[PDB]
Amino acid sequence: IGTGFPFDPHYVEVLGERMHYVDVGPRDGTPVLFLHGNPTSSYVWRNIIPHVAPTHRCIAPDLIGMGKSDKPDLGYFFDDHVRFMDAFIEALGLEEVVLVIHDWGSALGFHWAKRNPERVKGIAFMEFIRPIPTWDEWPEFARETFQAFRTTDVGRKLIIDQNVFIEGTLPMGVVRPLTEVEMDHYREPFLNPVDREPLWRFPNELPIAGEPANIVALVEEYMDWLHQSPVPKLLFWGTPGVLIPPAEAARLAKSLPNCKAVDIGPGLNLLQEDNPDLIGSEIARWLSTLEI
Ligand SMILES: *CCCCCCOCCOCCNC(=O)c1ccc2c(c1)[C@]1(c3ccc(N)cc3[Si](C)(C)c3cc(NC)ccc31)N(C#N)C2=O
Ligand SMILES: [Cl-]
């Protein structure tokens, strides 16, 4: 699996801040918008995009506060990311899009899709945000960790002072061992502890056991939208997963209309790091079946 990131940097001013993004592939045609989550960046797409860019434009932004994007003094609530992603999509003048989304990137993509349904030609998604009704539906191995994350005192000392979301959660989200070069790429935006606020606010926003109820409600709404939408859907899943265990992937593959599900083999959260070749080639094949 490749550790390089060859893409030329592109930047765009969004709401007064500079955001970075990858932009490759043909300039014509429907673009494919790749949205990463916590605590990654466009780096998480580096081995997927080269499968897609020969036939379709690939756009991969770094979320505000993340990757090579600027670091405004925000709370980095989900609502902050929604505002910046909305403004990024409009700054690039995108019209219709295909989404490829993961983790908090999927909460962004699904929520944008619900509000802009005529502009979404397909959604590929993996290890995505859905409501977790009780802590029992969270993986046992990860339960005490995430309960501690979701506190002001203990959670900030773990995530901000000790950088535990980068040095622990991230490699614990990949089945294979991440290399030192790959870790350094994920570390780069967060070398300064003051810049780690998004790493801590994100898990405090996760819709688990009914809280925070505003996120639970927003996620419920876009899942209800997704269940009733004819949009083409491509779901990647792994064993044992984290957000989407295999029994949930099986349930969704039946319940979501127009859905193809792909078993990538072993995986936790960052499926892209365990089987990028299958995810990228399967996306390129799925795209070639779409009306775009
Ligand atoms: C958008 C959602 C993204 C999900 C990304 C990946 O999520 C899945 C993995 O997240 C990490 C979940 N925690 C564990 O898997 C785990 C399992 C056992 C033990 C820990 C954590 C433990 C630990 C062990 C080694 C290191 N280097 C660090 C850690 Si901690 C500081 C993250 C930790 C904290 C807590 N309480 C807050 C309990 C255990 C750990 N640990 C120890 N000691 C384990 O035995
Ligand atoms: Cl998170």
Residue numbers in the entry: 4 to 295
What does the paper say about this structure?
Here we present a GSH-sensing platform for live-cell imaging, termed targetable ratiometric quantitative GSH (TRaQ-G). We hypothesized that a SiR dye in a spirocyclic form would be non-reactive against GSH, but it could isomerize to its zwitterionic form upon binding to the self-labelling protein HaloTag (HT), switching both its fluorescence and reactivity against GSH from an ‘off’ to an ‘on’ state. This sensor is based on binding of a spirocyclic SiR ligand to HT, which induces isomerization to the GSH-sensitive and fluorescent zwitterionic form.
We thus refer to the HT-bound carboxylic-acid derivative as TRaQ-G-ctrl, whereas the cyanamide derivative is hereafter called TRaQ-G. GSH titration experiments revealed that, whereas the HT-bound carboxylic-acid derivative was completely insensitive to GSH, the cyanamide ligand bound to HT responded to GSH in the physiologically relevant range of concentrations (~1–20 mM). To understand the difference in reactivity between TRaQ-G-ctrl and TRaQ-G, we analysed the structure of both conjugates by X-ray diffraction. Using MD simulations starting from the zwitterionic structure, we found that the structure rapidly relaxes to a stable conformation in which the cyanamide forms a persistent hydrogen bond with the backbone carbonyl of residue P243. Instead, we focused on TRaQ-G, the ligand of which undergoes fluorescence and reactivity turn-on upon binding to HT. Once bound to HT, the strong fluorescence of the TRaQ-G ligand decreases upon reaction with GSH.
